[PDB]
Structure 1
Amino acid sequence: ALLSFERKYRVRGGTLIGGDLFDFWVGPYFVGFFGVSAIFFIFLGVSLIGYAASQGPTWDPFAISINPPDLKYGLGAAPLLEGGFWQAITVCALGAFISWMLREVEISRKLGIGWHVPLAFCVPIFMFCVLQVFRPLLLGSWGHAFPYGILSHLDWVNNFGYQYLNWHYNPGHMSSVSFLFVNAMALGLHGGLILSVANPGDGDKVKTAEHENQYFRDVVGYSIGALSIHRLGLFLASNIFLTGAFGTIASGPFWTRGWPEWWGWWLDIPFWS
């Protein structure tokens, strides 16, 4: 149940809490304190989903939807059926995600590698907090958060967009979408380039770093380099949400009109009006 090269890496150490007590594996999975922590919040969360589902109409997993409370309840607590389940499940989700991130730190430390992955994984946790915690706080109600259902969450995104008439004109969104597109393209390019060098076809020889740099210098007149494309990729992916967050938070608390009208700052300058 070990990879051929794995045994030599399976030493004690690198935990943040508990020392030797949780320093072990179940099959391929490292445990650690944050492993135990994660499994607690996951077990609690999935149970509350099951309990909520049992009170609702259906057992169809694609129709299940645990929704936040009506706006009336503000930042207060709500009856379980009427949004309380939603509040409990959000706390378990945060618990599970933060546990998962800190478990990645323990694994990083045991292997003596950089902490870059758990750091990168903080970006989507932040964005979840912007949608479910920071934005609802600034508007004064948990009711502004998105519901936990596979299809119902799309209806929330849809209505949220159309509350600002045309969400495409949101400057934070324009940035976010630009990073999503260039990131998807760059992964294609990076993945394609590596495969092109290691698999040239027809029992021909594997090529070189020099071939990689030459290919892109020929095609676009620049090659960023092998290390730098990995740093760039983390940059492009991360900025999908780091720029997006400002467009989401701005919508309601810092802007109440349609997003097209925002561009009035430019269009309505007196000297060309």
Structure 2
Amino acid sequence: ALLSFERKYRVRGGTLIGGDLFDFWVGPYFVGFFGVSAIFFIFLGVSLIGYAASQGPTWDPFAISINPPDLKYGLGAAPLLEGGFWQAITVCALGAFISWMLREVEISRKLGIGWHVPLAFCVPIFMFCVLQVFRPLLLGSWGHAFPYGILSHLDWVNNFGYQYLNWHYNPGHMSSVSFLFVNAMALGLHGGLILSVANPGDGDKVKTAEHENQYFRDVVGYSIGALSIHRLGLFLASNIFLTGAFGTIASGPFWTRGWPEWWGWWLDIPFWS
């Protein structure tokens, strides 16, 4: 039921809303007011997805697709089987994600720790809003948003990119991809370094903070340090979406041509043309 060190931490308090009313656990899970609102939005959103899918052509989990309205509906409500289920599921998704984030703040407060995790989780919630709310608002129709389907959301990403001929030349995408790659590489370096110090092999002794810093000073001439690699990892991962969002919002509202042609700002300077 409890970890061997857990009981002393299970004290009352730390909520943002509700106080003692929902301040309790169900098995390992903390509830709180935002645990109750998270379960409400998750139950509604999954129920709406299940009923929308029951009216479509397939029960295959890869092929099911619940889609937004035609562009002609603009920012208005659409009939349920013509975009309205998608609209209601999107509101439940945002409610569930924000409830999840604020519940993490209550859990952090009860434990006396920093709120850095819920703050970091605001980044993917923000990117979901860029894709489903802010860009569609700027273009004037909910129908520019992505559909809910395991493979169909990929068909939307695919066509969206090719609407700008070659999306790889989008400068916001180049930044986003570069952060995705250096973050995945850095996480392998960090996980591998900590494991290599704690697990030298062959009954050898566990090594030290000094050995950690010596390894990368030897391999690349610099060690960022044990606290700082965690600040760097949060920074690299967060900037996947914090820079990518600029590339997503620019496409349509601030640029309608192919992305390769955008680089004419450099290529077409009269001096070297």
String of CA shifts for 1:92-125, please: whole Å, max 9, x gaps. 0000000000000000000000000000000000
String of CA shifts for 1:234-272, please: whole Å, max 9, x gaps. 000000000000000000000000000000011111111
Deviates more, 1:107-116 or 1:50-59: 50-59
Whole-angstrom distance in 2 between the partners of 1:167 and 1:50: 34
Q: How many angstroms does 1:61 deviate by?
A: 1.8
Residue 84 of structure 2: aligned partner = 84
Whole-angstrom distance in 2 between the partners of 1:27 and 1:264: 59
String of CA shifts for 1:201-225, please: whole Å, max 9, x gaps. 0000000000000000000000000
String of CA shifts for 1:130-159, please: whole Å, max 9, x gaps. 000000000000010000000000100000
Whole-angstrom distance in 1 between the partners of 2:169 and 2:54: 41
Q: How many angstroms does 1:59 deviate by?
A: 1.6
Whole-angstrom distance in 2 between the partners of 1:155 and 1:60: 17
Q: How many angstroms does 1:200 deviate by?
A: 0.1
Q: How many angstroms does 1:57 deviate by?
A: 1.4
Alignment of 1:46-65 (within 5 A): 46-65=46-65
Residue 28 of structure 2: aligned partner = 28
String of CA shifts for 1:156-210, please: whole Å, max 9, x gaps. 0000000000000000000000000000000000000000000000000000000
Q: How many angstroms does 1:50 deviate by?
A: 1.0
Seq. identity, %? 100
Unaligned runs of 5+ in 2: none
Q: How many angstroms does 1:62 deviate by?
A: 1.5
Q: Secondary structure at the match of 2:19?
A: coil
TM-score by length of 2: 0.99
Q: How many angstroms does 1:58 deviate by?
A: 1.6
Whole-angstrom distance in 2 between the partners of 1:238 and 1:38: 24
Whole-angstrom distance in 1 between the partners of 2:85 and 2:186: 41
Whole-angstrom distance in 2 between the partners of 1:157 and 1:18: 40
Alignment of 1:93-108 (within 5 A): 93-108=93-108
Calculate the aligned-residue CA RMSD, in Å: 0.4
User: Structure 1 stretches (4+) deviating beyond 6 angstroms?
Assistant: none
Q: Does 1:180 align with 2:180?
A: yes
Q: Secondary structure at the match of 1:226?
A: coil
Alignment of 1:255-266 (within 5 A): 255-266=255-266
Whole-angstrom distance in 1 between the partners of 2:17 and 2:239: 32
Q: How many angstroms does 1:56 deviate by?
A: 0.8
